[PDB]
Design a protein around this ligand. Structure first.
Ligand code: HEM
Length: 154
């Protein structure tokens, strides 16, 4: 797929709001993910002992990890589709070290869209949500193609 510039504009306009509090957005997203799809928590050896949302919010390691993840995602979105280099090391570690299936990348995509919708309703109407969804579908389709080249296609 190819997003138009107007779509990329809608995505970087709400992303600029997220960047005003990257650590708080990271927490909300991961908490939403772990609550909605508990199986994804099992993939994290560092965090799978966390039993409640209260424990998750209080985890300083989880908040540092959410900042790492959103920073890497933001760098990919700011490329506007020219993200081949950024995607390489990310696809290698998620396919060969962490073993994350594409279906889990759909689950975090849903969590990102839920949290933007809750926190940024004015900058996340139907058109802006449709553009963010297109941008995350492009990221998932490109990562899935790299998984296949690396031998995992999971
Ligand atoms: C927006 C999608 C994602 C992005 C941009 C992303 C990014 C990252 C980054 C930048 C790291 C640190 C360096 C590395 O190991 O590569 C990381 C680690 C990791 N990611 Fe992801 N990730 C994504 C989705 C997921 C999903 C959905 C899962 C699991 C369901 C996953 C599981 C992990 C694991 C197990 C680690 C190691 C964490 C730790 O112990 O340090 N990632 N991810």
């Amino acid at each position: 797929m190819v997003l138009s510039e107007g779509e990329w504009q809608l995505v970087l306009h709400v992303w600029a709001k997220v960047e005003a509090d990257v650590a708080g957005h990271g927490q909300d997203i991961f908490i939403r993910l772990f609550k909605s799809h508990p199986e994804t928590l099992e993939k994290f050896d560092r965090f799978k002992h966390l039993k409640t949302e209260a424990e998750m919010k209080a985890s300083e390691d989880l908040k540092k990890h959410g900042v790492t993840v959103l920073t890497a995602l933001g760098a990919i979105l700011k490329k506007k589709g020219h993200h081949e280099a950024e995607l390489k090391p990310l696809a290698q570690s998620h396919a060969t070290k962490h073993k994350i299936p594409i279906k889990y990348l759909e689950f975090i995509s849903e969590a990102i869209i839920h949290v933007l919708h809750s926190r940024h309703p004015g900058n996340f109407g139907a058109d802006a949500q449709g553009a963010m969804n297109k941008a995350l579908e492009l990221f998932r389709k490109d990562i899935a193609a790299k998984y296949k080249e690396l031998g995992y296609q999971g």
